[PDB]
Design a protein around this motif. Structure first.
Motif: not given
Lengths: 153, 92, 43, 43, 49
Positions: B67-74
């Motif tokens: 998820l952490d990647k989404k919070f930073e990619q999003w």
């Protein structure tokens, strides 16, 4: 059994001396194979010479000598046949030996091409195994990291 | 003497073949064939061991959650779009 | 010396007898294909 | 002395027996080509 | 030139000669590809350290 990487380096080192040792041994057959081949020609040459004299054996009305001369060569005739086939057997054998050697050298180099490509990866993890241990991540606060031990003391 | 020489003629012709197999007995053992993946080959033992350390980093200090990647990619899309959004108005 | 020959032929088996056909039967296509275009390419 | 001869002939193999044909079979074209133009060039 | 001089039989011999290298090119035609993607991963690790 030493460290897997340490053994590999030493293991390849003794592999080099192995092929060259096999390199020398194969050459010996080639020399001897030629030497016998040449020996056959000389042996066949001398025997052929006796037959040449057979003309003079009977030309001078000495056919009795020709029979003696004719029986003389038969000793070499068997010898020529005796060594007339030993060379043939060796010929087809060494060429098989030659095929084996080429693959090892072709195989040997390709294996070495990837030798270091793993050593760097191996040393990536060992260095990527210490930094975290020294400090770790502040989120967890393991206190096993030497850095934390400084803070508590 | 006639017998002796002929025997010696074939002495080395077998030694080379003998040393063909001994060298043709080690290379496969060191590496083997990747199709089987014996893992007895020393080369494979290197591969398995390096993986073990990879787990320590991925486990002792877990990497960021997927998820952490989404919070930073999003959110980077908002950042990149925001700067160019003002750029167009700023240009005008 | 024969005993060691088995290890190579057994520990890591050689290609199956069929495998030679799959590569020999196709090399004919490769060699014939290149010369087939060669004749047309020449013309 | 024969043993060393093998090293050169084996460590770095000499040109294949075919290789001589590829160069001998073509030198005839070269020598014939130059004289072929020579006759026309002379005329 | 193998077939130009009416020596197509030599061309077949020539054509079969290259096939030995054709396999070798393919043999090493993929080993490089595997190494390429691996080192770049190794490079990433070093920079962080």
């Amino acid at each position: 059994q030493e460290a897997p990487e340490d053994l590999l380096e030493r293991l390849l080192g003794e592999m080099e001396l192995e092929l060259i040792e096999l390199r020398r041994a194969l050459a010996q057959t080639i020399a001897t194979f030629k030497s016998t081949e040449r020996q056959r020609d000389a042996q066949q040459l001398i025997a052929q010479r006796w037959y040449e004299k057979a003309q003079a054996a009977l030309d001078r009305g000495n056919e009795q000598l020709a029979r003696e001369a004719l029986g003389q060569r038969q000793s070499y005739q068997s010898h020529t046949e005796a060594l007339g086939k030993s060379l043939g057997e060796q010929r087809a054998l060494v060429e098989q030996v030659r095929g084996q050697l080429q693959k090892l050298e072709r195989k040997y180099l390709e294996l070495k091409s990837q030798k270091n490509l793993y050593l760097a990866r191996l040393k990536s993890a060992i260095a990527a195994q210490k930094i975290e241990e020294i400090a770790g991540n502040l989120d967890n606060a393991s206190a096993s990291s030497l850095f934390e031990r400084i803070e508590t003391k | 003497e006639r017998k002796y020489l002929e025997l010696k003629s074939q002495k080395n012709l077998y030694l080379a073949r003998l040393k063909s197999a001994i060298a043709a007995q080690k290379i496969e053992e060191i590496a083997g064939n990747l199709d089987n993946a014996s893992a007895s080959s020393l080369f494979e033992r290197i591969e398995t061991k390096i993986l073990e350390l990879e787990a320590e980093r991925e486990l002792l200090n877990p990497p960021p959650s997927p998820l952490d990647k989404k919070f930073e990619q999003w959110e980077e899309q908002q950042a990149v779009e925001a700067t160019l959004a003002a750029m167009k108005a700023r240009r005008s």
